[PDB]
C-alpha cells in the first residue's frame, strides 16, 4: 500500500501529470519517498522539467536537500538539465548551492560541464564557489578549459 502509493507518486512526477500528483498527495503519499537509486519525486520533477510539480512538492514539504545514492540533489539534476526556472525556484527555497555529490561536484560544475551558461551565471549570482574543488581536484574553470568553451571561460572569469 505505502510502497505502491509512493511508486505511483514517483511515476506521476516522472511522467508529468500534475493532476495525478495532486491526487496522490491528497491520498496520503510521501513526498520524501525514494526509489531504488534514491530519486525522490522532487528529483524526477526537476529532472523532467515540470515546474508545477516541483512547486507542488515544495509546498507539500518535499526535502529539497535530499540526495540519491550518488549524492545528487535535485539542484544538481536541474542544473545538468539546463532548466533556468527550476534552478531559480530551487535556489529561491534555500537549496544547498554548494552541495557535493559522491564526487564532490558542485551544481556549478555540472552546469559548466553540460554547457549551460545561464545556469552557471544564475548559480554564481546566488553564491556559487568558483574555486570549489571536487574529489579529483578539478574546478569549474578547469572544466571550462577542458571543454574549450570560450563563453563559459569568460563567464567564469
Amino acid at each position: 500500500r505505502k510502497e505502491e502509493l509512493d511508486k505511483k507518486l514517483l511515476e506521476a512526477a516522472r511522467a508529468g501529470q500534475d493532476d495525478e500528483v495532486a491526487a496522490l498527495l491528497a491520498k496520503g503519499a510521501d513526498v520524501n519517498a525514494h526509489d531504488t537509486f534514491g530519486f525522490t519525486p522532487l528529483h524526477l520533477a526537476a529532472l523532467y522539467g515540470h515546474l508545477e510539480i516541483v512547486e507542488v512538492l515544495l509546498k507539500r514539504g518535499a526535502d529539497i536537500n535530499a540526495d540519491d545514492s550518488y549524492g545528487r540533489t535535485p539542484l544538481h539534476l536541474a542544473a545538468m538539465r539546463g532548466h533556468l526556472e527550476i534552478v531559480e525556484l530551487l535556489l529561491r527555497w534555500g537549496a544547498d548551492v554548494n552541495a557535493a555529490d559522491e564526487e564532490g561536484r558542485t551544481p556549478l560544475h555540472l552546469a559548466a560541464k553540460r554547457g549551460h551558461l545561464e545556469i552557471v551565471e544564475v548559480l554564481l549570482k546566488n553564491g556559487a564557489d568558483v574555486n570549489a574543488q571536487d574529489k579529483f581536484g578539478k574546478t569549474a574553470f578547469d572544466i571550462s578549459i577542458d571543454n574549450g568553451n570560450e563563453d563559459l571561460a569568460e563567464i567564469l572569469q
Binding site: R14, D35, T36, F37, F39, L44, L47, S69, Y70, R72, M80, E103, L110, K113, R114, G115, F136, N147
Partner: protein
Amino acid sequence: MTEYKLVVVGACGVGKSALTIQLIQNHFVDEYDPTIEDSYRKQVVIDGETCLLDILDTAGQEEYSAMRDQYMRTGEGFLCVFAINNTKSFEDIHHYREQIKRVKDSEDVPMVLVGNKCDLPSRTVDTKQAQDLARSYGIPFIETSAKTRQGVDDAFYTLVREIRKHKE
C-alpha cells in the same frame, strides 16, 4: 594517473547505467531512470598501475547535445552494450558502431562488445553470432551480468587494455 575517457553506448534498457553503477558503487540497481546522462569517475588498479576512468553513460535521445558530442569525439574507448535477450539491440549495435565510426572519423576505434543480462536464461541472441560479429569487427566480446556483477570488471579492463594497445 591516466584519465581514460570511456563511453558506454547501446540501446534502451540494455543495462549501460546498471553496468556503470556496478563498476562505480558495486551494487545493482533494479530500476534506474531511462534518461539520466552523467559522467562517473573511478579510481581503478589495472596491471598494478593506478588509473582513472571517466565513463559516460549515454542515455539521452536528443539529437543535439554539445556535451555529449564533445565527449564522444574526445572519448578513447566505447562499450557497445546490448541485451542478449533482445535481438533488436544486437541489430542496432551495428548502427551505433557506424555512428561512432563516422563521428570519430577513424578506422581503428577501441570498441568492446558487451552482452548484458547474462543471468537471464531466456537468451535470444546466440553467443556464436555475437562472437562472429566481434571477430569480424576485430574487437573483443565480453559477456556481463549487472545483477550478479560478473564480467563487468573484465569488460572495463578489456576496454582499457584495448585503448592502451591502440595508443601503443
